[PDB]
Design a protein around this ligand. Structure first.
Ligand code: ADP
Lengths: 185, 60
């Protein structure tokens, strides 16, 4: 919403925020190499696509398409101090015991909606490969339905027979108070 | 006789005009049908083209 104002389009309402969310879900992708992608978009106009708001009024966006999700890898674009998702993944790995991180390097599982951009698995693998030692096999696992992985796994879990003793019954709550939840389960 | 001759001649010509209008609106209907099917086809083709071009992008 903030980066689209430099082309003239101004979305300020909450409804317009929903419109911009739809634009993001339809036109944005992750660039494998950000710098030369930027130079390419500057040179030609083959990256420009068009979107039609729900009153006519087509809008055309250029390098915004990949500048929007690039923030995941350079969170300094929005004034945050953290590191990109590739770097926090690598740090979380390197915070684990040296014997399991070879098997962690090869089972990076992606989940949730924000991991649905075209080309995010390739960029992620490139970055982690550049960070990790040159002997490990980096494998990014990105299922085609990863937007509902949490719900699917939750149904699998709640269906297990060995899980039917892990519920928090009403009686346990009546005994222990709301603090039952984290104190035991 | 001028009154009644203008009357019935203009009336039958008005009938011909309304039939021409019905023909014109049916032409509008068929043209609109062609337009809608063709634009839907264009939409499908364009979205598939975009999928395939980005697939070549990732592949290469
Ligand atoms: N195809 C897509 N491409 C890019 N982003 C998407 C896509 N689909 C959803 N999103 C983003 O994912 C978010 C919703 O994802 P979701 O996993 O449902 O989050 P939550 O689990 O918190 O509800 C939205 O903010 C939207 O911007």
């Amino acid at each position: 919403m903030k980066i689209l104002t430099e082309r003239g389009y101004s979305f300020v309402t909450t409804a317009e925020r929903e419109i911009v969310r739809d634009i993001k879900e339809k036109l944005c992708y992750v660039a494998l190499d950000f710098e030369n992608e930027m130079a390419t978009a500057a040179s030609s106009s083959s990256l420009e696509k068009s979107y039609e708001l729900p009153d006519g009024q087509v809008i055309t966006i250029g390098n915004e398409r990949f500048r929007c999700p690039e923030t995941l890898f350079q969170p300094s674009f929005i004034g945050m101090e953290s590191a990109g998702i590739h770097e926090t993944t690598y740090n979380s790995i390197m915070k684990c015991d040296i014997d399991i991180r070879k098997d962690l390097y090869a089972n990076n599982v992606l989940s949730g909606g924000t991991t649905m951009y075209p080309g995010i698995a390739d960029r992620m693998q490139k970055e982690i490969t550049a960070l990790a030692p040159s002997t490990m096999k980096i494998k990014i696992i990105a299922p085609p339905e990863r937007k509902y992985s949490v719900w699917i796994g939750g149904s699998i879990l709640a269906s297990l027979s060995t899980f039917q003793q892990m519920w928090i019954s009403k009686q346990e709550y009546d005994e222990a108070g709301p603090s039952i939840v984290h104190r035991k389960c | 006789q001028l009154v009644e001759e203008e009357l019935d001649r203009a009336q039958e010509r008005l009938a011909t005009a309304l039939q021409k209008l019905e023909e014109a609106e049916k032409a509008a209907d068929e043209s609109e049908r062609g337009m809608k099917v063709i634009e839907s086809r264009a939409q499908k083709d364009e979205e598939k083209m975009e999928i395939q071009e980005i697939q070549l992008k990732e592949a290469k």
